[PDB]
Design a binder for these strands. Structure first.
Ligand SMILES: [Cl-]
Ligand SMILES: [Zn+2]
Ligand SMILES: [Zn+2]
Ligand SMILES: [Zn+2]
Length: 122
DNA sequence: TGCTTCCCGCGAATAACG
DNA sequence: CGTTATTCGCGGGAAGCA
């Protein structure tokens, strides 16, 4: 196979055969296991780099386009990702975006073609 | 030690299937 | 096209880096 299961207290866990990492969702183990197999490739469409997860490539490509999707709603500054946005708000505004903040806006991705969540443009 | 990347549960978007 | 199976964007913590 590619995993085995483990059950404690009815809780079902899926364990990677290779590194023994534990997953609550089989789809997550599948997502993860590509790291070992490289069955699927995700090549950057701007340079040579290849990635083993779709999202690693996506985040990498955002760096190529320089799009800044995360905007601080307190002062208007924009950031390329959640982490810089959160870092900013905690440091400059002494507030936490965690949970439902209403402190930042995530703009739709426009600088390349990725699946669009409807909630991002209402 | 302040960035930077890596990770995984969750659930919306969509591809596969019949 | 209707169901379901699959993909992968998202949050936000953890791990890595130099
Ligand atoms: Cl922008
Ligand atoms: Zn593994
Ligand atoms: Zn690239
Ligand atoms: Zn701000």
């Amino acid at each position: 196979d590619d995993h085995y299961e483990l059950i404690v207290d009815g809780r079902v866990y899926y364990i990677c055969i290779v590194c023994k990492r534990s997953y609550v969702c089989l789809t997550s183990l599948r997502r993860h296991f590509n790291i070992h197999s490289w069955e699927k490739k995700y090549p950057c469409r701007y340079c040579e780099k290849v990635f083993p997860l779709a999202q690693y490539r996506t985040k990498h490509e955002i760096h190529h386009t320089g799009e800044r999707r995360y905007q601080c709603l307190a002062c208007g500054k924009s950031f390329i990702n959640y982490q810089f946005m959160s870092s900013h708000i905690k440091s400059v505004h002494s507030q936490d975006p965690s949970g439902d903040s209403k402190l930042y806006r995530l703009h739709p991705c426009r600088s390349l073609q990725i699946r669009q969540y409807a909630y991002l443009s209402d």
